[PDB]
Amino acid sequence: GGEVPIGDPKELNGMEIAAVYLQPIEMEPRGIDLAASLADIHLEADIHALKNNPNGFPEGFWMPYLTIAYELKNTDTGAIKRGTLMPMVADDGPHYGANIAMEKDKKGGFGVGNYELTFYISNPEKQGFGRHVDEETGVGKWFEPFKVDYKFKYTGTPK
């Protein structure tokens, strides 16, 4: 393995939205995220433009400036935690991600088991990103905030 897919990707609002996890990843700038040593997985959202995206993004481009909150629930134990993914880059391109404590989680209940993952996604305007709205070069309005849901079995840190 190396990279473990979470559920099936969704296509909505002119974007493909997939979720994957890796082993914990050391990040810079130092302190921008939970330390790899204190985590068990690195959760990623992969979000790219589809064909005929309605907001001016060419097919395949990364969708930047999104706000992505997450909710991770172990449905066996009831354990719930929430956070936000941050924009970042790996050698294979930009994405949104976060290091997450699972077995290391202090309240516990985030071990091996069945999970529900929710991403809550809001458009780039929230982060100061503009749209041309003239007749010749303008683009359509952005989507309203929305959620996408996945189910997956967590088997431990990929190795």
Under rule CB under 8 A, residue 131 binds its own copies: yes
Write the interaction track for its own copies spanning residues 36-65; mark x where CB under 8 A is met and - where it is not: x------------------xxxx--xx-xx
CA atoms within 13 A on the CB side of 149: 4
According to DSSP, residue 40 is labeled S
Q: How far is the CB of 78 from Cu ion (least distance, A)?
A: 28
Enter the DSSP assignment of 106: S
Residues near Cu ion (CB under 5 A) are 44, 97
Site for its own copies in 103-122 (CB under 8 A): none
The Cα 64–Cα 57 span in angstroms is 10
Q: Please, what is the end-to-end C-alpha distance for the chain in angstroms?
A: 7
Distance CA 129, CA 57 (A): 13
Q: Is 134 in the site for its own copies (CB under 8 A)?
A: yes
Binding residues for its own copies (CB under 8 A)? 1-2, 22, 25-29, 32-33, 36, 55-58, 61-62, 64-65, 86-94, 97, 124-125, 128-134, 136-139
